[PDB]
């Protein structure tokens with residue numbers, strides 16, 4: 467086989483000339499020369515079968531990315547998977563190679579307002595399509611927003627995505643979650659299972675604020691410190707906001723805090739475009755029924771240079787040893 471850093475990367479002879487890019491809980495990621503398309507690609511080695519939550523993420527992502535086709539959503543070009551079942555300890559998922567992501571971008575580069583308007587356009591354009599397929603990303607953050615050299619943007623990682631279930635969204639107070647903390651909407655910590663499209667809109671709003679200043683807007687250090695941060699900017703909720711929270715533990719927690727006033731966006735963001743902040747206001751709305759939707763955000767005057775509904779496509783149709791077999795069965799179309 468081929469090798470990277472004391473690690474097998476057995477991607478056949480179709481992919482040669484590996485360069486390590488990175489690593490994490492998922493596994494390891496290289497660039498590799500594709501000898502049939504004659505372009506370097508990203509390949510990531512997912513070794514998920516040690517625990518069932520990772521096998522869920524690998525099946526969810528594979529199923530979604532093979533069904534989705536959209537310019538602002540990363541796809542799957544190949545899956546390299548050992549030709550028999552027992553020989554399958556890893557899945558190698560092959561995708562277009564991108565230069566950077568927005569996480570690394572924000573840590574080193576000031577963005578101009580025209581780059582912020584454009585990245586926001588492309589995130590919502592892709593989200594419009596995700597939501598039109600009745601799916602929720604449920605983990606939008608800068609590191610899941612990939613970029614090539616000309617600033618075209620693609621959303622990645624669909625392993626935490628779910629089908630929307632607005633009718634079964636309600637739950638108790640401080641009930642645990644799995645979207646990333648700085649981008650978790652307040653209702654998650656209070657009374658939401660995160661099964662409505664509005665959860666994504668909150669995270670896009672957080673990413674927008676972060677592009678305006680290069681700093682995370684709500685930089686919590688733990689689960690309940692996150693809501694302190696959100697209320698520190700948004701203020702105490704209104705009586706109407708409170709009364710939509712029927713759950714008494716979450717209602718009485720909020721009643722229990724001292725009054726906090728709304729920090730005006732233009733003092734928090736003095737160099738920001740005013741249309742940008744009006745949109746940010748509407749994406750970081752405390753009440754998720756009041757929160758702006760994706761088709762509405764796209765039609766926001768901030769994005770009027772790009773807004774074209776007819777060029778903003780929707781989906782053709784909306785949505786353990788057996789996970790290990792279903793991952794096997796789903797990835798056979800590449801042999």
Ligand SMILES: COc1cc([C@@H](CO)NC(=O)[C@@H](C)N2Cc3ccc(-c4nc(NC5CCOCC5)ncc4Cl)cc3C2=O)ccn1
Nearest residue numbers: 491492508520523524527561563564565566567622623625
């Ligand atoms: C976390 O436990 C998991 C997770 C998964 C699965 C499904 O949920 N999740 C992933 O695999 C996520 C976390 N990842 C990791 C990754 C790494 C690189 C690239 C990539 N990177 C680039 N380019 C770089 C950009 C920065 O700057 C250097 C170049 N280009 C193209 C691509 Cl696909 C994409 C991904 C991606 O989607 C499955 C099982 N258990």
